[PDB]
Every structure is written in C-alpha cells, then in structure tokens.
Amino acid sequence: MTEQEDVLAKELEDVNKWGLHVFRIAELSGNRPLTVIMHTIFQERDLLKTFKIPVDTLITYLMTLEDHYHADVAYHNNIHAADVVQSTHVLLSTPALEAVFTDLEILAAIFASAIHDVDHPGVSNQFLINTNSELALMYNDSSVLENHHLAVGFKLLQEENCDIFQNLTKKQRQSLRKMVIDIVLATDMSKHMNLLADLKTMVETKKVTSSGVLLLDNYSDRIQVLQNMVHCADLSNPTKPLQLYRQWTDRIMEEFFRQGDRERERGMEISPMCDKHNASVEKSQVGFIDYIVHPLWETWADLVHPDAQDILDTLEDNREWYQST
Amino acid sequence: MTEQEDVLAKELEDVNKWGLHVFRIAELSGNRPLTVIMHTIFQERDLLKTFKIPVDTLITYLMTLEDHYHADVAYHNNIHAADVVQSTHVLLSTPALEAVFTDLEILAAIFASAIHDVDHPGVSNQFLINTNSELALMYNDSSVLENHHLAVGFKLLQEENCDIFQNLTKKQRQSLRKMVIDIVLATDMSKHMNLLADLKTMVETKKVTSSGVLLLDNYSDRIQVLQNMVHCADLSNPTKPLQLYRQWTDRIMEEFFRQGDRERERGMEISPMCDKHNASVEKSQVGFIDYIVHPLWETWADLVHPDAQDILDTLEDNREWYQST
Ligand SMILES: COc1ccc(Cc2nccc3cc(OC)c(OC)cc23)cc1OC
Ligand SMILES: COc1ccc(Cc2nccc3cc(OC)c(OC)cc23)cc1OC
Ligand SMILES: [Mg+2]
Ligand SMILES: [Mg+2]
Ligand SMILES: [Zn+2]
Ligand SMILES: [Zn+2]
Residue B322: how many CB atoms within 10 A of its CB? Predict the structure, then answer.
C-alpha cells in the first residue's frame, strides 16, 4: 500500500550503506528510528532465527529501550543510538572482516551499540562528578555514564516480555554479557587514547589471508576490534555526507551549550566548548578531526585496508569544508 | 570510675600495638569496636583538630557506619572492619614510613579501612555475579562489592549530622575521595596478583634516606604503598597472635560454608573452600599462607626493612602450627 507510498520501507533499504539518512528515518518512523533500524538489521542478519528470538519480544524491548533514551536531549538520544547501531552494522560487513565474527559476537556488538548511550542526561561524566550527582556517587567517579548505560540496557530485559536473550544457553548469555560490557565501557572518551594505542599495536602484528581477510584466532584480539569498531561508529559523524555531519554538529553544540549554561548558573568553571559566549564551532570541528577523529580512522583504515578508503576521503573533504567556512 | 574498673579504656591503650585484642574490645564496647577504635586513633593522631572535625559528628557517623555493617555476618562485619583499621594505623607508624604521609593521606587510609567492607552480605563477588544479583547488574560484574562499599561509606556522610569532612577545602575533599576510591578498589581479591607484582617493582627501585626512611616524592608511588598497606591489613589475620588468628579462621569458614550451602540449594557449582562435606580447614590455611599471605608480607617486609620482621616470624610460626595439627 503501495510501494512508492510507504517511504519508510524505501528508506530502510539503504540500511546496508554508509550514509543512510537516519534523520529522515527518525521522522518517518514517528521518532522511533532505533526500533525500526534494529529490527531491519536483525532480520537482515537472520538473527531472530539464529538465536530463536520471537518478534513480539524484540519489538517490546526496543520500544522500551527507545523510551529510556531522552527525546529532549539534543545529541545523546535515540537517533544517535540508531546512527551508531547502523554504522556498526555497516563496518561489520567490510571485506577484510568477512566471516571473522560469530553470530554471537555480531549480536553483542549490535546490542552494545543499541544500548551504549541509554538514559543519557545530556551532560558529561565530568559534570556529574563535579556536581556530586547521584550517579557519580553510585559509580565512584569512573566511567559513570558508561556504567549506567549498561545497567539500564540490561535491566530492561527483566521487563514484561522483554527478554530477547531468553532462548539462549547460559554459556552464550554469559559470553554475550562479558562482551557487551567490555564494548560499552570502551565508549568512555577518557579511554580513547589507550584504545587507539592498542589499535596501532594490533595493526603492526596483523595477520591476513591470501584473500586479504583478517586472522583473529583469540578472543583477546577479536573483542579489541569490536571495541574500536563501536568507538569509531560513536565518532563517525565527521565521516558521513556533509548534509548529515552538519546536523550532528548542531545537536552536539546545543547540548554542550545547555551544560555550560547550567555550569554558569552554578558558578563553576565552564567546560571546553560549552561556553556560547566564547564559541568557535567551525574551528572546534577542524580540531576534533585533526586530533581525535582522523587519527582514529586512519588507524582503522590500516586495519581493514583498503575498505575504509571512501570513508577516509569523505572525512578529509568535510575537514576542508569546515576549514573554509 | 575508677582506673582498673573501666576495662575498655585499659584495652584501648594497646591500640598502637600489633596484636590488640579486638574481640575483647568488641565485647566490652557493646558490639561497637569500630566506633571506639576509630575515635581513639583519631584522637591519637590529633586528626579532629587537624581537620576541624567536631566530635559529635564523628560519633554520629561511626555509629551509622557500624550499623551498616552486618552483625549476623561471621567474618565481613564491624569487628573485621575495626581490625583492618587498627592494623592500618599500626603499619602507618613503622620507622621506614615516618613523616612520609601527609595528614590528609593518613586520614584517607584510615577512613578507607573503616568503610572498605561496609554492607557486605557475606558472599563473594563471584556468587553475586553467578546469581544475577541486583548489585552485579548495577556494577556490571566488576569489583561489585568494592564499588558498593565505597558508595555506602560515602553516602552515609549525607545523613543527619554525619559529614566528617564538612570543614575541609574542596581541594582536600576532592583529593581524599580520589585516594579513598583508589584504595578500596584495590581490596578486590582479583587484583591481588597485580598489586603484588607492582609492589615487587617498587621494592627494586626504592629510595631511602641515611636514617632509612622511604622516599616517595610523587602521588603515584605514595597511593600504591597505601593500597598495598590496607591490602596487607586486610590479609593480616595469619600475622596476628595465634589466639586471634584461629578465631578469624573460624569466622571465615562459617561464612564460606553459609555461601556453599546457598550454592548447594540452588544447584550451583560449590565455590572452593565452601563445601562443608569436603572440608580441610587446616590444609587450606597452610595453602593460604604459602601462596597468598606470605608472598605478600615478604614483599611488604622488603619495602619497610626490617620493621616487619616480627610480623614475618609470627606468620611462619602460625604456618607451622596449622601444618602440625
Ligand atoms: C577524546 O576526545 C573527546 C571525545 C569526545 C568529546 C565529546 C563528543 N562526544 C561524542 C560525539 C561528539 C561529536 C562531536 O562532533 C559532531 C564533538 O565535537 C567536538 C564532540 C563529541 C570531546 C572530546 O574532547 C576533545
Ligand atoms: C587472592 O586469593 C584469595 C584471597 C582471599 C580469599 C578469601 C578471603 N578474603 C578475606 C580474608 C580471608 C581470610 C582467610 O583466612 C583467615 C581466608 O582463608 C583462606 C580467606 C580469606 C580467597 C582467595 O583465594 C584463594
Ligand atoms: Mg556514551
Ligand atoms: Mg572486601
Ligand atoms: Zn554515543
Ligand atoms: Zn576485608
């Protein structure tokens, strides 16, 4: 009813490609991008049958997960969530990683992406520490939000008909949890430097087949790749078509400025990039690429050579655009 | 009223010596050893005046802290708490560490010792993980209890007239919290191997004055010593006079067997040393000394040479006693 009419279905076909219009999907789905993109990817990778997950349990979980993301939060919301999911899903399919990961590992990274920012208040760990918040007390000033994201994402499974893992062996369920925790905790931005250093080391001693597919025998190497993958997905805004990048930039500044406002009314030191009266959005983005995003993606490109070549070029293009204006 | 009459005051004079009868103090204080030993040490080190802490706030906090330890728990209770406090307090006074630590650092280690096991349910992290408990969900299967001890110990400050840190500069309060967190998290037994390795390295590159006092210029080295100190205090039962050691052994077995019971009724793999039908208390203690306690204390003795010589001899004596019976 008909084919050109349900535009949602039509847009959901670009799910396998880097540059999917996630905002369009957000709008057409009724501010429910995370649910529809998850279910598409789950069907696309057959995961419902592979792990005997009923569809009406999957739906019920995703609905509640999506609810527990905050709609009124500019950047760290359900859209960004769906963005990172979809981005992970694409990176899971680059040539150099074919058949490398098991269904369970794949499942872990997607689920990890799905929950990785849930219940985000729209302020940084440091703000939660400095304001002596409930959560920073709860988690002793270390990976405060990342810990809370995992707690929320996992607890929601206990909700009325929400256990998407119900029909898994304890061995699987325990392995999955181990992996999901390891990934989400790596999304903490204060770990970025170690992750990158670790990823650089892995590039030097990488093992590839005649085809050019990566050899990762041990869990230790595999989980590290997944950690970096979702971290890259988390920092992928500047690698998307400029049209999307600029909207992601608008949302991150609106959220940053909201924090800096609260920091101002409390008489605290205003956090970098949070002062709207000392703003330089464009120069900030150039810096963000030059010291965070580009060094990361260049190292990711080395690992999957040369699958991330288009991604890397787009980045250096967008870098030049923000340098120009 | 009189001097030989208040036996509590008389026993509280042995506070500065290794081998204080903590059980006697527990009984004479009305099952309130932690409060009375803390207040003695605080007065002994003048800390109330040095940090402008009012006495009736100190009392009110210690009362509530002591309450939040579980009396019905055989080993991980308020007595063990007071034991570890008192043991830390003694180790803080060995020749080789004179004037090494600041009042704030000293305060941190004692407070750390005081709270390090609060609200302990009497089961291990692993049990809390394997039973999918609230806390393991809350803290994502890593340092579960240690995290919870810190949370509880710190939250109780917010209670009606309990803020013992009220009259501290933000700079101090923030430094203290940083230190207290670092210490308590090191009490996690799964970290033992790293702590020991780290301590061994520190022994090799140790710097001492002509007097024979340790030189620790940076925070990095200082906090590491405090971490090991409280960890040693936590594993000091076998270094005490046999009279006390054997009671600590009775309490740890009663608690272990209570867990193994619960594990049995749930149909789980019974944890090492928790099966009362496959028990070998004496042989277990010999092993505990040979692979955990002695390797740790030998390394601690090297660091403070030769201050821990009596401690080390007593250990090897008690080792021989459990080997004999
Ligand atoms: C490790 O370095 C950082 C990493 C992340 C941030 C904050 C942040 N988090 C997630 C997505 C972001 C996305 C951004 O641009 C779209 C951005 O602009 C600088 C900051 C972002 C700040 C950082 O400090 C410069
Ligand atoms: C790192 O190794 C361990 C450390 C601690 C434990 C459990 C434990 N915790 C605190 C105090 C203890 C005190 C004990 O003896 C009094 C004891 O007996 C083996 C076990 C104890 C078990 C361990 O496994 C063998
Ligand atoms: Mg995050
Ligand atoms: Mg403990
Ligand atoms: Zn994110
Ligand atoms: Zn303890």
Answer: 21
Tell me the CA–centroid distance for residue B112 and ligand 4, in Å: 11
What would the DSSP string read from start to end of A157-186? GGTTT--TTTTS-HHHHHHHHHHHHHHHHH
* ω into B306 cis (within 30 of 0): yes
In whole angstroms, give the CA distance from residue B289 to residue B273. 15
Q: Which residues of A125-150 are buried (b: 16+ CB within 10 A; e: fewer)?
A: bbbbbbeebebbbbbbbbbbbbbbbb
The whole-angstrom separation of Cα A81 and Cα A313 is 25
For residue A156 the two structure tokens come to 């929601």
**Which of A211, A236, A191, A219 is CA-nearest to residue A89?**
A236
**What per-residue string of b and e applies to B42-55 under the rule 16 or more CB within 10 Å gives b?**
beebebbeebebee
User: Under DSSP, is residue B129 helix (H, G, I), strand (E, B) or coil?
Assistant: helix
Contact (CB, 8 A) for A22 and A83: yes
Nearest-CA residue for atom 22 of ligand 2: B189
Atom of ligand 2 nearest to the CA of B75: 11
Radius of gyration of chain A (CA): 20
Q: Position A293: which residue type? A: V
How far, in Å, CA of B24 to CA of B33, rounded?
A: 9
The H-assigned helical ranges of B143-241 are 144-155, 170-186, 192-204, 219-234
Tell me which residue has tokens 């030097």: A204
**SS3 category, B208:** strand
CA dist A156 and B64 (Å) reads 33
Residue A214, strand partner residues: A208
Please give the DSSP secondary-structure letter assigned to residue A107. Answer: H
Interchain CB contact of B139 with A (< 8 Å)? yes
Give the integer Cα–Cα distance in Å for B272 and B282.
14
Among B82, B75, B38, B84, residue whose Cα is nearest residue B57? B38
For B59-173, strand residue ranges (E) read none
Strand partners, A208: A214
The separation between the first and the last C-alpha atoms of chain B, rounded to the nearest angstrom, is: 44
Q: Which domain holds residue B77?
A: 1-325
Give the nearest chain B residue to A145 (CA atoms).
Answer: B139
**By the CB < 8 Å criterion, does A242 face chain B?**
no
CA A83 to chain centre: 7
Closest residue by CA, ligand 2 atom 4: B189
Q: How far is CA B207 from CA B215, B217, B304, in A?
A: 5, 10, 11
A268 touches chain B (CB under 8 A): no
Please give the method by which this entry was determined. X-ray
Per CB-CB distance under 8 Å, the chain B contacts of A147 are 139-140
Q: Report the 10 Å Cβ neighbour count for A7.
A: 12
Residues 6+ apart with CB under 8 A from A142: B181
Alpha carbon nearest to ligand 1 atom 22, residue: A189
Rounded-to-integer distance, Cα A216 and Cα B231, Å: 38
Instruction: Supply the CATH number for residue A104's domain.
Output: 1.10.1300.10
CA distances for B231 relative to A241, B21, B42, angstroms: 54, 20, 21
In contact, A310 and A239? CB cutoff 8 Å: no
B142 contacts A150? CB cut-off 8 A: no
From first CA to last CA, the distance across chain A in angstroms is 44
Q: Which residues pair with B214 in a beta bridge?
A: B208
Number of domains in chain B: 1
| Residues of chain A contacting residue B137, judged by C-beta atoms under 8 Å apart | 151, 154-155
